Structure formats: C-alpha cells, structure tokens
Design an enzyme around this catalytic site. Structure first.
Site, PDB file in Angstrom:
ATOM      1  N   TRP C 136      -0.802 101.270  53.603  1.00  0.00           N
ATOM      2  CA  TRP C 136      -1.678 100.216  53.106  1.00  0.00           C
ATOM      3  C   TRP C 136      -1.097  99.664  51.825  1.00  0.00           C
ATOM      4  CZ3 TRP C 136      -6.040  97.511  54.987  1.00  0.00           C
ATOM      5  CH2 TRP C 136      -6.465  96.482  54.117  1.00  0.00           C
ATOM      6  N   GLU C 208       3.754 105.143  49.844  1.00  0.00           N
ATOM      7  CA  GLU C 208       2.756 105.669  48.919  1.00  0.00           C
ATOM      8  C   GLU C 208       3.089 107.182  48.857  1.00  0.00           C
ATOM      9  OE1 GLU C 208       0.105 103.674  51.906  1.00  0.00           O
ATOM     10  OE2 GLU C 208      -1.391 104.296  50.407  1.00  0.00           O
ATOM     11  N   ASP C 241       4.849 102.861  45.948  1.00  0.00           N
ATOM     12  CA  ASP C 241       3.599 102.164  45.656  1.00  0.00           C
ATOM     13  C   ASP C 241       2.607 103.173  45.142  1.00  0.00           C
ATOM     14  OD1 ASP C 241       1.115 100.845  45.653  1.00  0.00           O
ATOM     15  OD2 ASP C 241       1.281 100.122  47.757  1.00  0.00           O
ATOM     16  N   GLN C 244      -2.691 103.842  43.832  1.00  0.00           N
ATOM     17  CA  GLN C 244      -3.784 104.774  43.740  1.00  0.00           C
ATOM     18  C   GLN C 244      -3.419 106.053  43.057  1.00  0.00           C
ATOM     19  OE1 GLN C 244      -6.637 105.379  46.524  1.00  0.00           O
ATOM     20  NE2 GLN C 244      -6.744 103.278  47.303  1.00  0.00           N
ATOM     21  N   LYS C 270      -4.117  99.223  40.517  1.00  0.00           N
ATOM     22  CA  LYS C 270      -5.532  99.613  40.440  1.00  0.00           C
ATOM     23  C   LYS C 270      -5.894 100.378  39.177  1.00  0.00           C
ATOM     24  CE  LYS C 270      -6.576  99.900  45.369  1.00  0.00           C
ATOM     25  NZ  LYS C 270      -7.845 100.283  46.032  1.00  0.00           N
ATOM     26  N   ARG C 404     -12.712 109.630  51.219  1.00  0.00           N
ATOM     27  CA  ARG C 404     -11.748 109.483  50.135  1.00  0.00           C
ATOM     28  C   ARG C 404     -12.517 109.652  48.824  1.00  0.00           C
ATOM     29  NH1 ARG C 404      -8.163 104.398  50.031  1.00  0.00           N
ATOM     30  NH2 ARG C 404     -10.060 103.243  50.612  1.00  0.00           N
TER      31      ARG C 404
HETATM   32  C1  LIG Z   1      -1.514 101.809  47.972  1.00  0.00           C
HETATM   33  C2  LIG Z   1      -2.190 100.473  47.835  1.00  0.00           C
HETATM   34  N1  LIG Z   1      -1.398  99.389  47.595  1.00  0.00           N
HETATM   35  C3  LIG Z   1      -1.891  98.138  47.481  1.00  0.00           C
HETATM   36  C4  LIG Z   1      -3.233  97.944  47.599  1.00  0.00           C
HETATM   37  C5  LIG Z   1      -3.658  96.480  47.498  1.00  0.00           C
HETATM   38  O1  LIG Z   1      -4.017  96.159  46.164  1.00  0.00           O
HETATM   39  P1  LIG Z   1      -5.007  94.902  45.970  1.00  0.00           P
HETATM   40  O2  LIG Z   1      -6.132  95.158  46.937  1.00  0.00           O
HETATM   41  O3  LIG Z   1      -5.528  94.846  44.504  1.00  0.00           O
HETATM   42  O4  LIG Z   1      -4.076  93.786  46.156  1.00  0.00           O
HETATM   43  C6  LIG Z   1      -4.169  99.014  47.854  1.00  0.00           C
HETATM   44  C7  LIG Z   1      -5.617  98.836  47.990  1.00  0.00           C
HETATM   45  N2  LIG Z   1      -6.142  98.855  49.175  1.00  0.00           N
HETATM   46  C8  LIG Z   1      -7.604  98.994  49.517  1.00  0.00           C
HETATM   47  C9  LIG Z   1      -8.194 100.313  49.912  1.00  0.00           C
HETATM   48  O5  LIG Z   1      -8.711 101.084  48.993  1.00  0.00           O
HETATM   49  O6  LIG Z   1      -8.214 100.640  51.100  1.00  0.00           O
HETATM   50  C10 LIG Z   1      -8.400  97.998  48.661  1.00  0.00           C
HETATM   51  C11 LIG Z   1      -8.376  97.798  50.106  1.00  0.00           C
HETATM   52  C12 LIG Z   1      -3.608 100.277  47.947  1.00  0.00           C
HETATM   53  O7  LIG Z   1      -4.358 101.388  48.155  1.00  0.00           O
END
Ligand SMILES: Cc1ncc(COP(=O)(O)O)c(CNC2(C(=O)O)CC2)c1O
Ligand SMILES: Cc1ncc(COP(=O)(O)O)c(CNC2(C(=O)O)CC2)c1O
Ligand SMILES: Cc1ncc(COP(=O)(O)O)c(CNC2(C(=O)O)CC2)c1O
Ligand SMILES: Cc1ncc(COP(=O)(O)O)c(CNC2(C(=O)O)CC2)c1O
Ligand SMILES: [K+]
Ligand SMILES: [K+]
Ligand SMILES: [K+]
Ligand SMILES: [K+]
Ligand code: NA
Ligand code: NA
Ligand code: NA
Ligand code: NA
Lengths: 431, 431, 431, 431
Positions: C136, C208, C241, C244, C270, C404
């Site tokens: 994600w 991630e 990435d 989180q 975030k 989560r």
């Molecule tokens: C690892 C990772 N990378 C990028 C993002 C995207 O960031 P933005 O939503 O601020 O653009 C998420 C979040 N995704 C969400 C989630 O918690 O499922 C907000 C939808 C992320 O977890």
C-alpha cells in the site's frame, strides 16, 4: 566445395544477420531425411529443417501437389473462396477434437498466435495475456510479448498486460510440498500472484503442450487439466500453440488429444505446411460466432490462398494414409531407447525427455549436481556436423544445454540408427 | 455451378470469418489477368488477387521455378544458407538505391514491418513509432499498432509509444496557409505536436509511399524529402513500406526512386512473392552492423528458405527482362486516360489518382461538395462482378468510397480496354 | 446528539464517498488519545487517527508551533528558502542512518513515494518498478501502480513495468524447502521469475518494512538484507516506505535501523507531520547529485513551505526529548502482552504480531485451520465502538481479518489498559 | 544578512534540488503582499507565493482559524466526519454552478487531479485521457501523464492512453481558414486525429480554463463550449482544473462561470487552501452515485481532516464577505492598464494577457517578429528582485518568456503601483 569465395562474399556483404551463426556449408539439395552440401556430403536432418519437414525434404506427393496448383490456382483476393481452402478447413474440423469447428488459414506460426490472441481479446473484452516463462511463440508483436525464453531485452516495452508463470519442469524442480515437487501447488501459487497483479482484464493463457525452444519441457500429468480449470474460473480462453507438437509428431494427431483437454483456440503452423508457409487457428463455432458479431478482423494477403492450403490438405492426407502418427510412436521408441543406451555410456547425459518424435537430451557436467555443461554442447553439436548429423542445442538460463531432436515422421529405422551412431562418436569425440 | 450446397455448407460450418464477406462463387482456376468460376465464367482480376499477382496468375516461369525447387531444395534449418537466398539478397542490394545493402528474407508483409520496427528499436535504444492516420501495415502486434486506417478498436491497448500524424491528402485538404493547402506546414505542425507528447524516445517513422488501404493517397512533391529531414533531425529511422508500391507497380522499380529519397529500412512483400508468401527488409550495412553488435534477433521458421527465395529471384528476373516497369507506365497511362474519360461522362467520379498501375477512383455524390457516395460504390462494385470485373472499394471516415485498381503488370491492352468497358456499364447500371 | 438531521442531510447530499462507510457520529473535539462525539462521549483513538497522531491529538507543542508560524511564515514561492526547511532537512540527515543525506519536503505519503519513484527512474534510466503483492503506497498514479493490496481493478491499465512479488508472511506460509518455510528461497524464486519477464529495465523495488494495510506483516529476519542484495545485483534502487513505521512507532527511530539495512531512498509522511500534511524523501548525496545533473523535477505548490516543516521539526524535537522511541517499546510490550492474554482466553485470536506500537491481531474461526472469521471482525469492530474504542480491521484475500492497532506514542499505561479491557468485552460480546 | 554560511552550508549539504534554483536570500517573515529577508528587506510578493496566498501572507482570520482548530479538532481517522468537512462540502456545492453537488476534500492539486481522473476512468470504463500540449496538472503519476508543458522526458513511458491536442493560442496563431485564425476549426482538426488514434477508450479531457504554467493562455470565446460538445459526443467527461483560476482570481468565483460551461468534475487546490495544503474535486450527484455503485476508492491520510477544511471554509467566508472577487476585477484593471502603459514605453513587451488578477506579460525581441527575447526575461526577473519585486517567468518552446503575475486579491492600490514602478525600472535597467 562449400568454399565458394564469391558466395561467401555476397552473404557477408548483403545478408542481414538475424540470430545465431550461419553454418559454413552451401546446401545444394535436399531429399528425405537428408540435406546435401556443395561437395555432395549428406547431412542427416535430425531437426526436420526448422522442425517443419514432417514428410521429409521434397516428398513426391508434396511436389506433385505444389506443381499441380502452382499452375492451376495460386493466389486470390482474400474475399474469394476456392476448394482447397474449404476442404482444408473441413478436414481440420474433422480431425481435431470435438469443440474445434472453424479454421482460419494463414502463413506463419507467429501470425497464427497473433490471430488467436487478437480473437481472445475481442471476445473477452479484455487484454492481459498469460504465458510460460520459458515459452516461444514468435517474433511478431503480440507473439513476442508472450515469449519469455528470449528476445525481451533492448527492444522497448512489451505489450501492456503481459505476465508469465513458471512452467512445470520435473527435471529441475523448484516448488515443494512435503518433500515432494508439487507442480499443481506451484500452479496454484503462480495464479494467486497473477490474480493480485491483474487489472481485472485477464483474456487468455497461451501455452505449448511441450515447450520446444524452452528445453523440451513436457507439461506433466494432470497439469493441463488444472490449467484449463484456472482459465475457466477466470473467464479466460486457453490458447494451445501446437506449432511443433501438431500433426503427429508426439504420437497423437495433436498433443492436446493425449491429455484429453481441448483448448478454446488451437494454433498450428510448422508441421502443417511441411516446410511451406501455411498456418492455422481452429476455434469453436461459439467463439467464432461471437468474434464475428464483434467484427473480428484478420485480413491478410495470403489468408485463404489455394496453393498452401492445397499443400496442407495433402500433408494430412499422407499422415493419415501412411499411419505416420503410429509411426512416430514406434520410431520414437526406437530413437528414445537408443538415447537411453547413450546415457548409460556417458555421464554427460543428465536427462532424456519428450514424446514421440519430439525428444530432448539435456547435457550436464555433474550427473548428480545436474550442472549445465559449459561449452560441451557446442562441441558435441560441432562434432555431430563434422560427422554428418544436423542437430540443434538450446541454452537457457539455469538449465543444461538441450539438444532438440525431431526427425521427419518418415525417418527410416536405418536413419535412426545412423543418428544414434554419429551421436555417440560425436560425444566420445567432444569430451 | 457455384451453387454447390455441400461446398457452401462446409464453408459456413468450418471457416472463421475474418473481415468482409465471401464472394458467392467458387474460383476453380486462374491464368493471366483472369480467375474462373465454377461455371467457367472469366473474371478479370483488376486487383491482382490481393494485389500480389504481379506477373498475373500462374506465370509459366513461376510455375517452372516452383516445381524446379519444390523437388530440389525446399525448406531448411534457419542457420543454413543456400544459393537462392544469397542470390536474392544480392539482387535486392543491386537493384535498390545506394544505401540499401543487406536483406532479410521473410514470409509476410506484417512480418517484414515487424522485423524493421524491431531493428529500429534495437538500434536507437528507443521505442515510440510514428505512422500515418490512414496507414495499413498489417494485423500483427507492432504492425497493427502502427495501422490507423482500421482495426484499432475492441482489441485492447496499442503498443506503448504509438503516434500518428495526418497524411497529406490533396483531394481533401485540411491545413491552409494563405489560402493555400500547405502540406509542408501541416507536416511541421504535426511534428511539433509529436515533439510535445514524446517521452524523448522517438525511434522511427513508418510510411507507405502511396497509402493503398488509406485511399490511394500519394505523398505530394517534396513531402518525403521533408519527412526524412524531420526524422534525421530527431535521430529517427525512416521505414518505407513498399508492400504495394515495390517491384515496378508505380512505374519505377521502387517508389522511393521517383522521389529520390532512400529510407533507412525498406520493406517488401506482396509484389515480391508474386502471390507466394515471401517478404523482405533491406537496410544499410551500417544499420545491420549495429543491429548485429546489439544482438538483433528475428529467427523464424521460414526465414531464408530456398523455395520462396528462388521464386522471388525469378520474379525480379522477368520484371527486368520484360521491361515490366516501363510497361507499368505505358499501360498505366492507358488505364489512367480511360478513367478520365469515364470521369468526363459520370458526375459520380470525383477524382482519379495514383501512379503507374496503382490507381484509385474516388466516388462522390456532389462532384462539388465532394460528398461521399453512400452505397453507390457497393452497387458499382456489385455490378462490376456481375459484369465479370473483380474490383475493390475502400471506405474510410470522411472520404468517398475508393476503388483500388491494380492489374498485373502483364495486363494486355485489350484487357485494360475490357475493364474500362465493364466499368462504365457497371456505373451507368448502378446509378 | 450525533443525530443532527441537518448535518447528515448535508453529508449525504454533498460528500463524495471515497471508500468504506462514514462512522455514525459527529466528532467535535480531540485531545490526547481521545476523540469526542457530539454527545461528549470519549472514544479512545487506538489508530492515532489515520495512523498519524504520533503525539496524540492537539499536542500543546504542536499547537504552539502551528500558531507560532501561522502568523509569521506561512507559504512561499517554491524557489524560496526559509529556516524551518533547512533545519528540518538537516535534522533528517542527522537522525537517519549514514548514507541518507538530503531531503525533499512534501505534503503527502503518495506524493513522497511518487517523488522517490520518479527519482529512481531518472537516475537508472529505467522504469520497471517492483513491489509486494500486499503493498500500500498511495492512490496517485505511480504510487497506485505499485499498490497491490487493493485498488487495481476497473480503473484502466497500471503503469507500464509494474511487477509484484509475494511478501514473506510467516503466519500463512506458502513456500517450502525441506519441510521448512524458506522465505529466502521464496525470495530467490520470486526474483527468477521477475528476471524472465523484465524488459531489462528494472529501476527499483519499493517496500514497507512492515506492511500495514497488507495485514501487519513484518519482513522476517535477514529478508531485507537479502532483498537489498537482489537489488544491488540488478542495478536497482531500494525504496523504503516508512509512512507508518517511521518516527519511532516500531521502537527504533526508523524501521530500517533495526535490520541495519539502509535503503537508497527513504520516504516518510504520516508520523512525520503528526496529523498535518507533511512528507519527505531522504536520499544519498550521490543519488541527489546524479538526479540533479539529470534535471530532476518535483516542483509543487507546497514543497518547502515553512509552516509544515516547522511542524515536522517540533515533532522530532519532542520525540527525542521525551524518549518516545523507547516509550514505544515499553508501552508496546505492555500492549503486546495484554493481547496475548486475550489470545489465551479467546480461540478467535489466531495471531498477535507487529513491533513496538504497530501491532496486528489476526481474527480466525478455527485456531488450527487458521480460517478467516467471516464477519466476526466487523462485529468486534462494531462492539468496540459502542464500547468507546476506535479500531480498524483490514480484510485481504486468503487471510483472516486483521485489526491494526497503533495508538499514540504518548499513550498512557491506563489508556492501554482501557483499550485491552474494552477489547475483551467487545470480543466476548461479538461472539 | 542572508549570507549565513551555516545556513547555506546546510541547504547545500542536505537539500534535494527539485527544479530551478534557490533564491539567494533567507525569508524570515511574511505579511500581506510582502515577504521579508534576513536583513528585513521587503519583497513585494507578486506571485502570491506559489500562486496560493489568496488572502496574502498570514491573514489574521486564517491565523485565528488555524490556531482555533489546531488545538480543538486536528486530524482524524478517514472514516470519521466532523463539522468543518460537511460545512466546506456544503459551501462548495452552494457556490459552484448548478450541476456540481458533491465534494472530496484532499491535500494537493496533483492529488485532486488524480482523484478526478481516477473517477472518470471508473465511471466510463475507459482510460485514455486528453489534455493540452501546454498543460500543467502536477508531478504525480496520472497528473504527470497529462502534463505536456514539461517533465515528460527521461522518466520512462507515460500512462497508457495519453494524448494531447494543441491549446488555442491567439498571440501565436498556427491554424488558418480564409486568412483567419480559426481556433474552432483547429479544435475540429485536433479531434479528428484523436479519433483515429484512440483504441475506442476515451475517458476524459482535462483542462485549465487559463493555462498558467503554459504561458497565461486563455481559452478564447466559445472554445470551452465547443470542447464540452466534443466530449459529450464521445462519452467523455470534461475535467476542469481550476487550481490557479478558482476562488476569485480571474474575476468570477470560478473561471468556468464566465464561459457558462460547467464541467463534469471541477478541481481546486492552490487558492482554496490559501497557502495551506487543501484541495478538492466537486462533481455531480449522478457521477458520484455511479462512482459509488462501482466502488470508487480515494482513501488517504488527510482526506476529510478538519483543520485544513476549517481553513478552506474561512477563506471562502472572507472572499465573499470582502467582495474579493469584484476586487480582483478592479485591481486587475488597474494592474492591466499599467502593464499596457509599460508596453507603450518598451518594445520588449509583445503581449499583455490574462484575466482579473491572473495576468501574463510575454517578452519578445522584435515586437513584429514576435521573437522570444533570449535571456532578457531572466535579466528582468533578476533586476526586479534586486529592486524588491518577486516575479516568475516561464519559458516554453516556440514562445517568448512569460511573466506570470498573480498578487493577492487583497493587494492594495499602492502595492499595485509599487509593482508597476519597480517593473519599469527593472526593464529599463535590464535592457
Ligand atoms: C505505507 C503507506 N504509504 C503511503 C500511504 C499513502 O499516504 P497518503 O494516504 O497520505 O498519501 C499509506 C496510507 N495508506 C492508508 C491506510 O492506512 O490504509 C491511508 C489509506 C501507507 O500506509
Ligand atoms: C502497405 C501494406 N503493408 C503491409 C500489408 C500487410 O501484409 P500481409 O497482409 O501479407 O501481412 C498490406 C496489406 N494489406 C491488405 C490490404 O490490401 O488492404 C491485405 C489487407 C499492405 O498494403
Ligand atoms: C511453439 C512455436 N510457436 C511459434 C513459433 C514461431 O513460428 P514462425 O517462426 O514460423 O513464425 C515457433 C518457432 N520458433 C523457432 C524455434 O524453433 O526455436 C523458429 C524459431 C514455435 O516453436
Ligand atoms: C493548473 C495546476 N494544476 C495542478 C498543479 C499542481 O498542484 P500541486 O503542485 O500542489 O500538486 C499546478 C501547480 N503547478 C506549479 C506551477 O505554478 O507551475 C507549481 C508548479 C497547477 O498550476
Ligand atoms: K488471399
Ligand atoms: K528456414
Ligand atoms: K512552496
Ligand atoms: K483523515
Ligand atoms: Na473437431
Ligand atoms: Na542498393
Ligand atoms: Na544520515
Ligand atoms: Na452547485
């Protein structure tokens, strides 16, 4: 002598090089399982040319037929029908398994695969195509995008929606479940990954029953049945590319008959034309009907030309009449057993595989480490030729060099023996 | 009678429909500029089959040659050279303009274009391909992506990097500079837009000297020279597709000779094989050298097969010996003038265009509004056939229906007269 | 009451629905680990909002800082530098592992990943991107193309060169070598397939450290080291990435510090902005230098705006000063042990995983069949809220629903206890 | 002094360069239409920062609001609604033309365009996107694929289905019909070409009412109406990107109000957040309904966060209450007339264009050849700054350098005069 300096000057000066190297001889004539050089030296054609000379070189009936139509009905406007086209289409329907009813007669293998992939795309309204990572379907656009054994580098992006899955290779197993090579679990595993990547547009899976260019890899028992199910469950068509396996080579008229799984679209080419450029796709009445409703288009110069079609018709005629399919099994068994005796003698032979007259011999260094024999293949390949035996080895990443053996279905018992002979001398000599 | 219910039952039952409709006759024989039906009715072949029968149907020399090799040297392993291949490659170098040195002998037009596009991509390290919005290069992957006259819908995304620019069409002008149709300014305008979209990966421009499928659209004076400059300035190769224009049809051996502009890659096919499946690309020694260094691959089943090549060699032999190129100009002038007289008589003829024996007649309703004649073409086309004249009209968006006339270069004066006759009767009859 | 009909009328009438469902309350205020409804009911925020409220809601220092700059230095032309930008960039260099020197300060996570993917593409001259099938990274173009946990259907083709490989998931193992789940062999196996498909343009792998949206899947011991090697061997950049996982949540300042593997490009977002829109990428001096030479461009409206940057600076300030990283380990252990006691009591808890204050609880039906509990999660999720606990479950194909859990690093011991309490009552109640 | 060696050492050492060059000053404070350097020197902000400071820097009401929510309601789980979100969505519906009912509140302009393009793709089931060759929509994936004014090179292939058409540029006309620049015929001409290339998957056209990055190019009278018709006829959505034109800048609340053409999806961002990161898309109830049925997803971290939304609400509040829209017309006229007087004095000013407080000044060498002034712009730009005026010139292929002038809608009469003053001195000085 093949040493013609004028000839070689011209080849060098005016020929585009397209892969590999040119053999250093001048082939003057061909007849049966043999090609003859400038000196008149006979070379036993153990690959049936480019794996097409099903009835061997210059088959008397082929010659008659060709002449026969060369001066009667040759080429036509593509909207015009003639008898050889309709007779060939009818025959193909008649000899293929139930569920294959209509044919499109083309010129090349790649073209046949393109016609099928295009039709699959039209009919599903989708576009992602799935193939084997060791596949070979041709050099043209779509056919190339679905080819993973080679040619994917330095020529730009592939077709959008191109995916591959690993082919089940029993000699070199890579997926296990309880100590056992579970090729079905691998298949499941491969599809899960596909599912996750797909944009929801899976149109078809394209496959060879036996991967020739890939290393003479036969899909193991129950695999095709499992694959068709995977396709069925996803609304995908199954396209079977029998360019090398069709027309009796493996012991059945079509490779898909052995497994009992009939694909949605069947493609044929090499064997069908018997050295000449003729190819085809056969599909079900239902699929053709929908393609039609939808405006399917595959209009070319030679589609439905009488001459090649007339050739294809006679080829099927003699395969059936001379029981060349059974023949393939009997000569194959003879050729197969011989290869096994060679493997008894030489530790460099790690595996003998294939079916009917589509056999493969994988060369290794450690017949326990199953380590690819670095250069030994080329040497062997080299000695064979000196010896008068035309062979063809294929070298792919992670495997040993593989000899692809596929002599005419008309090959004689003596010819098979000759080849085995020469092959042993070539081996003992190259080591 | 062509009414054979068995025949028609089988066609219906087992043939894949691939575009258009099948003529309702059974073609039994062909000879010269004629095809004969089941009843023996002679149909004057004014399209040379699918525009391939350059020496007409079943040319005695072709027949000899075909038989000649059918039983001597037929098909070979693609790594093996033979004399007809080297002789054909040499001839092609010899008769093409300076700068074209090496050839690759293939099977189809689409295949020839794919081989060229692939080579252009390898050599530039780029991938975007530019063609004409009214182009026709084939049904296979790359060739299709570059085809804009048709086939782009319902079959998934095209090749990544596909662009088209408008072709210069003098009959129906659309770009003006001071009251005048400036086709060069249009060209400049088209390229500016291209430049802005490109990802910096322009590899080549592919073009027909005369767009056949497109509506018999001839690139006007100085255009090709301007286009080559545009390519040169951007590091792009110019690929000229002479499938229909090559081998004398337009009055010069190759269409590019008239303009004096030699492309980087030249493709040939239809005319070259004279009804048989043979095709080729010819390039410069330099481009071939770089492609080679880079590992160019275009390895197929029939690449370098002696039979077709031997056919191609004889075709060039008689075109030269019988002065068929000049012939094309003299018969073309005769055919052209006749069409003009017809245009004097019928207001439905809005334009007569083309070159040599590659002519086009555009049908309109208002010979002032230049409004496409809705259905009149099909009627005319219909009456011709009744009348015994095989014609072919093409209908594209925004233009009138266009008849594509291309009789054998061997056509007789009487045969040309016959066609003109029949065409007038068909016209007066369809109105 | 949250029952405001006017409010709900307007939401219904004028809000675009973007995924999921809207909770049926009106959040009026937030403070610490709590959000308050229209009735004043306190909801313990166990997800830190959308996993961003690292210092909890409305942290006094954040409030000061925001006000502080809101009226001093707010937004600027993107070519203008200010102190908070330079101080933040400097700090990021200072607290990240050696090899990360330069930062780009942006607004969103997806934007941060796009900036990194773009840079990787520029620098390698390549374009194919590899991610995890359960990843994600965001909703925008490139970030989406690299996202496989969801969103790939019904919205057209993905970016050209998009590949995924399976993520190593120890709870639900799928690749074995001698009875053992060999996640390294799986990795090898995955890359072989990639190699075969690639067009020779592999630019980067994006990952991630812990897949949040994916199901709280932690990359197992030695994996990242192995992955970086795979990238290194292929000329690919490794993009990590940490949207989180960054800024202390897992117990180390950055997740990559635990493994000791430093990526080529690090992305943050975030946690960095602490609820506000701020994001960043950090790369090595060398990579930035080459990107520069090459004309890297990522010019936006808010890039380098002082306010958000000033916010980011204070966030790091208090994380360090209040030892929130260690805190994450101590509160995490407390929260973790509690979850394990719950798992002692309820057979519906199949697994408790994660690190520091980034935990996951996977719900199952048969704690032996590890069968996903169909609807039980939603029920639990439902009861929690009634109970006053904001949770978030994620449901992916083939796994059980996963909760989560990620409370503020400022969470209190009593708050952790509260959540555990409520969670048990929610469980016993939903069964 | 701005000469802080420590500061500059750190910027150099730890900042990723992202386009352009960094101004050589340290901005310490901002207030109204001014930014102040380290020395306290006031720089008149004639671009409103990055064209966002609609109420100027640190507007007292903005400051109050920000503080107000900074400590009350900050960031939330994206499934949770709050009052500022619903109030903002309601307001947007209320102030946009009929046919725009529902909003999605995001963070950036690029993000807003991505959300709209994604929605258009979902709803049509198609994917090809059409933009202007001089467009600017953002740096992220989809937004970038649709951006042609820059950034398309060296970063891999664009999104599949990307097309551009030329924007109507009256200053530099390129399409004529009877001596006249027919921008409508050009539009027709552009679409015909599109039609021929499309794969039958046209999803939407994306456009700026006035192309800012493009060179302050205003779509001429009747164009938008014609474009919407072109979209309507093809089943395409019209997406209007008002990042720079929205929220009163051009003299109407939204640029689309002047033409009277309401798009299918409206995007806002820069002006909406007044320097802060807030963006939005507004669509019709019908389109939102279908997107919903279809599972539209655009779930991010900051979507629907109360703070930014609360900011957006106050911005609209004061624009309306202080009649800043009318103001834009009156100050624009004053600024516009001044520029014209400058153009009376200097032959280097070839054109003054734009609307309201979105103006452009195109620099040329020959005010007859309309030849772009090579370097003069940069010089002018340079002298302005010395002089204390922040300007921004854009240089695109084939045009002169263009100054983009866009001061706060709160700009004073004296401030406008100041800028004009400084601009003349900068000009006379740079020549
Ligand atoms: C690892 C990772 N990378 C990028 C993002 C995207 O960031 P933005 O939503 O601020 O653009 C998420 C979040 N995704 C969400 C989630 O918690 O499922 C907000 C939808 C992320 O977890
Ligand atoms: C310029 C040009 N290039 C390639 C081709 C394709 O050749 P093949 O059909 O043999 O592959 C055509 C023919 N096209 C057709 C036509 O006459 O319309 C046969 C369909 C062609 O004209
Ligand atoms: C299964 C299969 N499908 C299609 C083709 C391509 O056919 P054409 O080469 O005639 O187009 C091959 C052959 N491939 C070659 C080989 O023997 O390796 C000729 C190259 C094929 O084996
Ligand atoms: C019409 C339009 N649409 C989208 C954007 C991108 O918005 P973001 O930069 O906030 O994502 C711009 C700005 N572009 C920049 C410019 O002023 O040139 C900031 C670079 C825009 O003008
Ligand atoms: K034909
Ligand atoms: K061959
Ligand atoms: K900025
Ligand atoms: K949110
Ligand atoms: Na059958
Ligand atoms: Na030549
Ligand atoms: Na560091
Ligand atoms: Na409205």
């Amino acid at each position: 002598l093949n040493d013609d300096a004028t000839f070689w000057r011209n080849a060098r000066q005016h020929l585009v090089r397209y892969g590999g190297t040119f053999e250093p001889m001048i082939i003057e004539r061909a007849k049966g399982s043999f090609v003859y050089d400038a000196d008149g030296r006979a070379i036993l054609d153990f690959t049936s040319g480019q794996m097409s000379a099903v009835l061997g070189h210059c088959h008397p009936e082929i010659v008659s037929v060709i002449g026969e139509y060369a001066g009667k009905l040759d080429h036509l406007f593509s909207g015009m029908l003639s008898r050889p086209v309709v007779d060939l289409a009818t025959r193909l329907a008649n000899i293929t398994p139930p569920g294959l009813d209509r044919a499109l007669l083309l010129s090349t293998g790649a073209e046949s695969n393109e016609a099928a992939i295009r039709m699959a795309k039209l009919v599903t309204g989708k576009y992602e195509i799935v193939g084997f990572a060791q596949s070979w379907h041709g050099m043209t656009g779509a056919a190339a995008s679905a080819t993973y054994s080679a040619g994917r580098k330095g020529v730009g992006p592939a077709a959008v929606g191109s995916f591959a899955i690993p082919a089940p290779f029993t000699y070199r197993p890579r997926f296990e479940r309880n100590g056992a090579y579970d090729y079905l679990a691998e298949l499941d595993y491969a599809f899960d990954l596909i599912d996750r990547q797909s944009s929801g547009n899976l149109a078809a899976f394209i496959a060879e029953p036996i991967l020739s260019s890939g290393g003479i890899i036969e899909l193991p028992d129950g695999y095709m049945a499992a694959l068709k199910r995977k396709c069925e469950a996803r609304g995908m068509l199954l396209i079977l590319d029998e360019a090398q396996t069709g027309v009796g080579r493996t012991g059945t008229m079509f490779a898909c008959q052995r497994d009992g799984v009939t694909p949605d679209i069947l493609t044929l080419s090499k064997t069908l034309g018997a050295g000449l450029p003729l190819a085809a796709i056969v599909t079900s009445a239902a699929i053709e009907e929908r393609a039609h409703e939808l405006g399917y288009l595959f209009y070319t110069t030679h589609v439905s030309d009488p001459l090649p079609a007339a050739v294809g018709l006679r080829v099927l005629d003699v395969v059936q009449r001379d029981g060349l399919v059974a023949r393939a099994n009997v000569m194959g068994d003879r050729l197969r057993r011989g290869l096994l005796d060679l493997m008894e003698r030489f530790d460099c032979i790690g595996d003998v595989r294939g079916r009917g007259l589509l056999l493969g011999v994988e060369i290794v260094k450690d017949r326990r480490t199953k380590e690819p024999a670095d250069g030994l293949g080329a040497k062997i390949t080299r000695e064979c030729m000196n010896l008068g035996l035309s062979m063809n080895i294929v070298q792919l990443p992670g495997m040993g060099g593989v000899f692809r053996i596929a002599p005419p279905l008309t090959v004689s018992e003596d010819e098979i023996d000759l080849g085995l002979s020469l092959l042993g001398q070539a081996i003992e000599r190259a080591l």
